[PDB]
């Protein structure tokens, strides 16, 4: 005869839904019956068939609620509250530990019985990705720890390279591999405050294509990207607690999370370059282009730019003695599954086709 | 080129240093004979009205200033 | 039954949490059981195992509250209210007195049994920091009092120096040593009002890297930093009660707190320089660079830029007759602990390696 | 059991607290016990030990209130409401009458038994202040009445003088002597509306350092100060009811209060100068500089820029026949106290040291 | 028992208070006792001693109300609602009829027993005002009707004249004589919408000193005044229902009221001048200056710029056959009072001293 | 003892009041008594004496309501809701059908017994209006249908003509003849969104005097009018559902209604002219000027720019076979009234005086 808020909040803490309308719709699907729900039998969304029977009782009354958006609203705040806390208690290495596990959770489903993901294609992506930069997997481990160590004025990395090379492909996958959001600074420093407020309680930021006055002869349009970066020195250093705003009333005043800044061969001030760590010049390789011309599954199923892809690359090359001691037991698990499905011959055979310019899976 | 008694007279209206046109112009010479600005002159002048105890200003007390304090330290006659 | 607001407000006044979502999440961790709480046994956060048994009763019902964000909201206002009052009653010297004690409280935990902080490394930072500027500790005492005396048009200090020298490293530590926030003026004078409203009830402000039209030949990008500073004359003087805005409706109209303004060799107007007190030209020293190359613990554990670091430097050099009479008894306490762990030989031996260009702890 | 709003509102009307969070914190200190309150025995804040026993009963329940910010909120509105009314009923001379009395109230405490203010130092400030401009006290009386008479296009005064002279020192003290707020126009005409809305129900305004295009050869940075002043002709005249905005929804449409405009030798349009009354060119005097070099108590305890300082100067020189007939009885009171502590010799002896360049109290 | 809203609303409709905080404070003065109220006996404000006994019963409980600002809030809306209606039902001539009567109501009090206004001084102002422009009284009647007739692209008048002449003195008095508000366009076209929304349900607008690019050689600062005027063609014509905004949510979409535009000899586009009706070039007369030099009562008591002053000038010269037939009976009333106190000799004797350059009352 | 909302909403749906404060005041006039209401006997406003007895019962209690603005608020939403629906169901021709009838409703009152409108003057306006442009009535029918047909990139008409010619006179009348609102684009593209959101659920838009860079030699001030028009290509075409915002939260995403764009001989880009349909160059005729010089009733009573005027012109010339079949019966009604009062001689006799330059009614 009354709706339960603790249950809705519970479901929220589970799916970690930090959205209002999203959390509302998802919960409004349990006000029917899991008795004949197609989505429950077909095993489509783990956030449905795994929580319907758990919240079917409350959702039944939730439908006749006059505060459907209010109940879910408080849940969202509880979700953001959790992250608000974890960003202070758990070390930057533990935060990743949880991420790496959540990334594997999806894998245990997609690469299982209720999954439609083909491990062969994702293993092929690990090949293309390793053929993108010298010792790609090696660099990934360095970036990861670089994010963990968190060294002032020694955090952001530079993905400076021409158009179409792999920047937006890697800078994106890394975002999901570690966790966080991708911002933009091409817009005036007006809405910059309304966008920089997304890095709150995050792990890392991703600045996509920053426009600068430099490169006026290379047909490179100028903007405010490079400029804005310099107008955010402390933000790049992280030695001080910058100010952030979330929905009018201030929500945080913490240390601006590190990250990656991408660009297309624009000019970079010395006072700006001194805020970076490493500069990775992406090279527009042809064999990579011809490679995807016969490997649509990488661009279609989003593999070359998936965080799950890099995870497979971290478990394939990097030893177990490098991961968290609480996850080392899970790393070995897939080191057996991957070596079982693919040996060392079938693997390099894929990187081989990459060198040729043909399908990775040929 | 003088020192404009109007710039030195101001300091005389602050401490209540009554001085007619003839008296104020008498200090203008002190600003040209030594180079002491209107601000440093009035500052050193009243310190002469304490060493001799004289809370009054005539043409004698203002004259003995160039023979007691400034006379033993002329910087434009060495 | 019923949820208690005075208890939540009490916990808020304790941790001095001036955040809404943060105060919410932290309190939502006491709705379980301190009986087996790992965070309570492991002694991770003093704001947890020290207040769970104290608020376990209310938090238990807090979970089933329909106003979880409302209850914590009022608490936040009570927190800001406290600071709102202290900024008027307690003298500027007493405000620091409390800060210095809170800084030592963390030390009594990290340098104790339930702490993972190594006093050796922090003592090493005091060495590197003293090798940053001539009579560093001496300057710190001057700045402190300079902030206490609060002299109109004689408050802000200038940290003008080339890229990578120690500006952002000191200007940051000082911020935590005294207390306050760090602002930025590189952004248009539009959102300037939404950022300058952070110095409310604060102690000092920190302007990080101000861009000016000057230095166009030194590859120094121009901006609005220097300009904005001049567009805030009264703000720099403090002889008048400037206007501030916090979340739409005005929250304060007080005297703009003093602080520090940093820059990278930009041109400075005479009408602006006349608003400062002292100009510290930071020199990019090599031996300092090579020093950190073998002392990662300073950059990792954040020591060279920690307020706690400067505190150790103030207790090591400066006598007890300079601190507050209500804290002089605590200053002598650490003057015995530090001299017990490190003599005068082991100390200078660290500053020695600094001169060399090797690890401070060698 | 129930909280009283009339009591909180009463306390608000007493301290005239026009702040929300401030009024909240101050009232939250009476929910303990005046039985052992240190602030009540030490006699620190007249707004504490004088009202605790009066509001101890309500504050006791105020703590367990779910609307701590709401109760105090209404009180604030009642406070602003009072000023909103007085700005229309009481003549501009009566408004000052009340101010002059409130300024003396502080004096009766600081210069009493429960005060830590030394009358000797404040009397010394009256000396330095009188050595700032020819017939300083005389000018003060003229400005006061100039504000009372309120003559259209004949209200604002000009404090045009070089850097470091006494402008910001006097323009500030006068603000507290009469009452009101100090605004700024160096910022774009965008937030100008959000700042000009402070002069609501005020008495006078103080424009600190206005930047103009003039003086480009005198190393004087140009801005929008002078320009904005001209973009506010009616605002300067006061013959029409200008529009003002306070927190989104308009709060007033009255006559813009007179005031003082300060600057540093910038160029001034004739159409702008015709909106002023008198131009006071502040002269950077040396003896004044050397004076404060041996009189730190003036800059520390804020005396040379205190409204209470000018009050002592008005009671020392100006006769009783010039004050309000309802305050003439109080003016004579201090004319006996001041003449009792300091004769005419000890007074001029201080102005004497000013002429020298030594401590006023030597 | 319970607070009455109809009573508060009634008082609001009486004083026509369109303010929230103002209406609140005024009503909070009846929660005491009219038994010994000084303001009730001294007859200071007609909005007090005339309504205290009427609202003493409700105000007594109003004090213990938890919605003091809410009750008065609704009243304000009822006030604006009244004007919102009158601006559509009553003809533009009837609206003035009510104004002229309200202006006389003040006179019946100030020029009565409970008034401190001297009719001699106000009659002197009528002399100075008539010596400001050729057939001043004659022009006033034309402007009045010009506002009544309301002829598209034939409404606004131009008060173009040098600095200090009488523009701001007349353009102000006229505003009160007819009714309305005075706006400004010197500010960017950004806040223009937040200021133009004041002419809602008004009668006429007053643009004070509009800055234009013209007159660059006459030391006349340029701005956006003239430009903004042209950017508001339809606003000046009034043949279409322009859009207006009051406090976020739109409050009106009516015909922009006519008015007067003042300036200081700036250049005026032909497309702009074609939106005016008559151009009155104010001449900076000397005898007028010397006149006020011996007639401070005009500038002090605000007479030369008072709407009540022009009213006396309309009743002195203009016949009764020109006023509304419902007010003609009241016009004759003062035509007897004025002719009783002052004949034709004493009147012209004042305009005589104006010609001389001495006090109007000599 | 309860207030009815359905009744207030009913009255709202009747008068179609889409205003909040307006709907409030109008309804607050029925809380007295229609027994002696002067406005009810005099027959002044059809929205009063026709609904007082209908809502006297509820309005009586409405006065003692604590939500006077809330009750009327919901009514407004119901009003906008109606239009929100009609703009989708009723064809663009039916929408006009209702408008034409509402325009005649006013006529049946003003041209009746309870009306003060003289049919002679309005018939004279039809003469002046027909002497404004060749086959004026003919053009009106074309525009009407042009609005009905609604042809993409073939909707807006151009009223390009010199100052004072009849543009603002016709573009205004047409607005009322069909229905809708008149916007402006001279203001920055900033508040453009807050103004373009008025065309929501409307029929047509009216852009008054658009300023362009062209015509710099013809003393024509440049602006952003012409530019903004080009910055709204899709808005002019109407082949896509543009975005609109009403009071913060979006209220509509429909097809931008057609309309008319007026200007004063400014330059027009080819890419802009291609968005129009017909260009009507208004000629500043003298005989029209001299005509109004003896026909003040047209400018006073607003006839030459009234939608009711054009209606009379549509019923006089255009046959009945052109109107809606549901209104054809009403068109013939006035075709008998007009021909009864005025023959063909008295009509052309008016257009005759127009040719002369004398009063249309001579
Ligand atoms: Zn299901
Ligand atoms: Zn615990
Ligand atoms: Zn106490
Ligand atoms: Zn009374
Ligand atoms: Zn009626």
UniProtKB/TrEMBL annotation, chains A, C, D, E, F:
<dbReference type="GO" id="GO:0039502">
    <property type="term" value="P:symbiont-mediated suppression of host type I interferon-mediated signaling pathway"/>
</dbReference>
<keyword id="KW-0862">Zinc</keyword>
<keyword id="KW-0945">Host-virus interaction</keyword>
<dbReference type="GO" id="GO:0008270">
    <property type="term" value="F:zinc ion binding"/>
</dbReference>
<keyword id="KW-0597">Phosphoprotein</keyword>
<dbReference type="GO" id="GO:0003688">
    <property type="term" value="F:DNA replication origin binding"/>
</dbReference>
<keyword id="KW-1121">Modulation of host cell cycle by virus</keyword>
<keyword id="KW-1114">Inhibition of host interferon signaling pathway by virus</keyword>
<keyword id="KW-0413">Isomerase</keyword>
<keyword id="KW-0238">DNA-binding</keyword>
<dbReference type="GO" id="GO:0052170">
    <property type="term" value="P:symbiont-mediated suppression of host innate immune response"/>
</dbReference>
<dbReference type="GO" id="GO:0042025">
    <property type="term" value="C:host cell nucleus"/>
</dbReference>
<dbReference type="GO" id="GO:0006260">
    <property type="term" value="P:DNA replication"/>
</dbReference>
<dbReference type="GO" id="GO:0039645">
    <property type="term" value="P:symbiont-mediated perturbation of host cell cycle G1/S transition checkpoint"/>
</dbReference>
<keyword id="KW-1078">G1/S host cell cycle checkpoint dysregulation by virus</keyword>
<keyword id="KW-0899">Viral immunoevasion</keyword>
<keyword id="KW-0378">Hydrolase</keyword>
<keyword id="KW-0547">Nucleotide-binding</keyword>
<feature type="domain" description="T-ag D1-type">
    <location>
        <begin position="1"/>
        <end position="92"/>
    </location>
</feature>
<dbReference type="GO" id="GO:0005524">
    <property type="term" value="F:ATP binding"/>
</dbReference>
<dbReference type="GO" id="GO:0039576">
    <property type="term" value="P:symbiont-mediated suppression of host JAK-STAT cascade via inhibition of JAK1 activity"/>
</dbReference>
<keyword id="KW-0067">ATP-binding</keyword>
<keyword id="KW-0922">Interferon antiviral system evasion</keyword>
<keyword id="KW-0479">Metal-binding</keyword>
<keyword id="KW-1090">Inhibition of host innate immune response by virus</keyword>
<keyword id="KW-0347">Helicase</keyword>
<keyword id="KW-0244">Early protein</keyword>
<dbReference type="GO" id="GO:0016787">
    <property type="term" value="F:hydrolase activity"/>
</dbReference>
<keyword id="KW-1048">Host nucleus</keyword>
<protein>
    <recommendedName>
        <fullName>Large T antigen</fullName>
        <ecNumber>5.6.2.4</ecNumber>
    </recommendedName>
</protein>
<keyword id="KW-0863">Zinc-finger</keyword>
<dbReference type="GO" id="GO:0043138">
    <property type="term" value="F:3'-5' DNA helicase activity"/>
</dbReference>
<keyword id="KW-0007">Acetylation</keyword>
<keyword id="KW-0235">DNA replication</keyword>
<keyword id="KW-1096">Inhibition of host JAK1 by virus</keyword>
<feature type="domain" description="SF3 helicase">
    <location>
        <begin position="135"/>
        <end position="295"/>
    </location>
</feature>
């Amino acid at each position: 005869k009354q709706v339960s808020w603790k249950l809705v909040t519970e479901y929220a803490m589970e799916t970690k839904c930090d959205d209002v309308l999203l959390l509302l719709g998802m919960y409004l699907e349990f006000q029917y019956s899991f008795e004949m729900c197609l989505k429950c039998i077909k095993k489509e969304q783990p956030s449905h068939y795994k929580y319907h029977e758990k919240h079917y009782a409350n959702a039944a009354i939730f439908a006749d609620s006059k505060n459907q958006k209010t109940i879910c609203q408080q849940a969202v705040d509880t979700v953001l509250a959790k992250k608000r806390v974890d960003s202070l208690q758990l070390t930057r290495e533990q935060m990743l530990t949880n991420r790496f596990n959540d990334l594997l959770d999806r894998m245990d489903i997609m690469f299982g019985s209720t999954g439609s993901a083909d491990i062969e294609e994702w293993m092929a992506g690990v090949a293309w990705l390793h053929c993108l930069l010298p010792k790609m997997d090696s660099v990934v481990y360095d970036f990861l720890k670089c994010m963990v160590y968190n060294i002032p004025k020694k955090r952001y990395w530079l993905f400076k390279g021409p158009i179409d090379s792999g920047k937006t492909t890697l800078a994106a996958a890394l975002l999901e591999l570690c966790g966080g959001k991708a911002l933009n600074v091409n817009l005036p420093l007006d809405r910059l405050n309304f966008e920089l407020g997304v890095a709150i309680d995050q792990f890392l930021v991703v600045f996509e294509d920053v426009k600068g006055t430099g490169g006026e002869s290379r047909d490179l349009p100028s903007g405010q990207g490079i400029n804005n970066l310099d107008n955010l020195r402390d933000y790049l250093d992280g030695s001080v607690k910058v100010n952030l705003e979330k929905k009018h009333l201030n929500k945080r005043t913490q240390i601006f999370p590190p990250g990656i800044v991408t660009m297309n061969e624009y000019s970079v001030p010395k006072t700006l370059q001194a805020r970076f760590v490493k500069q990775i010049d992406f090279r527009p390789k042809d064999y990579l282009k011809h490679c995807l011309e016969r490997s649509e599954f990488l661009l279609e199923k989003r593999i070359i730019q998936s965080g799950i892809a890099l995870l497979l690359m971290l478990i394939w090359y990097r030893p177990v003695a490098e991961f968290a001691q609480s996850i080392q037991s899970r790393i070995v698990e897939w080191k057996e599954r991957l070596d079982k499905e693919f040996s060392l011959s079938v693997y390099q055979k894929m990187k081989f086709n990459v060198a040729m310019g043909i399908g990775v899976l040929d | 080129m003088s020192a404009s008694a109007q710039q030195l007279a101001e300091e005389l209206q602050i401490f209540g240093l009554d001085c007619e046109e003839a008296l104020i112009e008498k200090l203008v010479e002190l600003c040209v004979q030594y180079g002491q600005n209107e601000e440093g002159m009035v500052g050193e002048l009243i310190a002469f009205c304490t060493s001799t105890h004289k809370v009054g200003l005539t043409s004698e007390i203002l004259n003995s200033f160039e023979h007691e304090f400034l006379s033993k330290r002329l910087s434009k006659a060495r």
